[PDB]
Design a protein around this ligand. Sequence first.
Ligand SMILES: N[C@H](CCC(=O)N[C@@H](CS)C(=O)NCC(=O)O)C(=O)O
Ligand SMILES: N[C@H](CCC(=O)N[C@@H](CS)C(=O)NCC(=O)O)C(=O)O
Lengths: 201, 201
Amino acid sequence: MKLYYKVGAASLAPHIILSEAGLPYELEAVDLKAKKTADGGDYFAVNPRGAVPALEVKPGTVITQNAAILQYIGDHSDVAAFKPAYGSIERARLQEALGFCSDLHAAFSGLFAPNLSEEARAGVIANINRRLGQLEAMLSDKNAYWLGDDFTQPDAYASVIIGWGVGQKLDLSAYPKALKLRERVLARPNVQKAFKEEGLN
Amino acid sequence: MKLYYKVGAASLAPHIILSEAGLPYELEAVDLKAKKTADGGDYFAVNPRGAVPALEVKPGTVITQNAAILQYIGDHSDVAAFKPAYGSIERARLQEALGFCSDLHAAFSGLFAPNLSEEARAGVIANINRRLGQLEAMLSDKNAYWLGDDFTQPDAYASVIIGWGVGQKLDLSAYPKALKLRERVLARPNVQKAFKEEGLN
Ligand SMILES: N[C@H](CCC(=O)N[C@@H](CS)C(=O)NCC(=O)O)C(=O)O
Ligand SMILES: N[C@H](CCC(=O)N[C@@H](CS)C(=O)NCC(=O)O)C(=O)O
C-alpha cells in the first residue's frame, strides 16, 4: 500500500501504524501548498478533499480519512489490539477514541491557519485547552495506554497531535497522563522508525 | 439501548439508524444549555465531552462519538449494508464517509455558535460551501445512495446535516445530488418514524 503524507502532519499516525503492523508500504510526500505530489502531479486526483493522509490500497483504490485508514491497516495486520471484532465494546472504544482524536485535531488545526489574529488565536488556545482537559480526563491510570493494556491506533494519533503542541512550545505540563502516553509511544521502536522515515527527531 | 439526543441535532442520525435496525431502544432528551438530563441530573456524567449523541448500550457502558455509535448499532443489527466486514473495502468506504460527515458537521457547527459576527459568519459560510462542494463531487449518479445501491449510516448523517442548511434557508440548489440523497432518505418510513419521535416534521 502507498501512504500519502506530509512531514509531521496527521498522516504520521497511519505511518506509525503501518510500521508497527510490519506490512510492506511505500511513502509519498505531498506539497500541500501547491497541492502536488512529488512528481508534480495533481494531489486532488489522489484526495479531492486535498488532505493527508490518503492510503492507496491498490491502484484505483484510495482511502481517505484517518479513522478509515487507521482501521483498514489494523484489520489487515496481525496485531489483535488493532482489530477488535466489529460490534464488540472494544471496537466501539477504538472508534470512540479515534473520533475524539478528530476533535482534538480540529482544535489544534486552528493554530496553523494563515493570517491568524492574536484574538482569534486566543479562542483556538481556549479550545485546545478544553480538548486537552477532556483527553486528560478520559485517560485512566489503570491503563498503560489509552484503551487498556495494549497500544492501539488512537495512541499514535493522540501522540502526534500532542507533539504539535510541543512543537509550538505550549505548556502541557497540566496534562501528565497525556504526556506520559506520548512518552510511552515515542519510545516504541517502530514509532521511532516512522519518525526517521519522515526525517524527524 | 438508550439514546441521548437533542431535537434536530446530530443525534438524529443514530436515532434514524436505531429505527431502521428495528432493535428496541429508549430515548433521553438532553438540555444542552444547562447540560442536564430530563430528570435534572448532570449530563456530563453521561458524556464528559458534553455532546449528543451518547448511546448507553447497557448500564455502565456509554459510547460517545457518532462514528462509533452508528457502527455499533449497525454491527448489532441484521442489516447487512450497515455492517460490512472489517477490513473489506466496503467497511473502509463506510468509515471514510462517516469521517467526512464529521468534517461537514464541523463546518455547519460554526453557524450556530453564540455571538457570531457577520464577518466570522461569512467564513463559516465559505467553509460550508467548500464542504458541500466536496460532498457533491463525492456522490456519483451511478449510486442510489452515497456508498452504492444500499442505504447506510452515512446517508442518514449527511441528510441531517444538510437539513440544518435547509432550516437556515441556505440556498443548496447548486448541490442537486446532495438534495436528492436527502429527499430519498426523508421518504424512508423508518426515517419519518424517527423524526416523529423527536416532534419534528
Ligand atoms: N506544522 C505542521 C504540523 C502538522 C499540521 O499542522 N498539519 C495539519 C494536520 S495533518 C494541521 O495541524 N492543520 C491543518 C490540517 O490538519 O490539514 C508540521 O510540523 O508538519
Ligand atoms: N439548531 C439545531 C441544529 C442542531 C445543532 O446545531 N446541533 C449541533 C450538532 S448536534 C450543531 O449543529 N452545532 C453544535 C454541535 O454540533 O454540538 C436544531 O434545530 O436542533
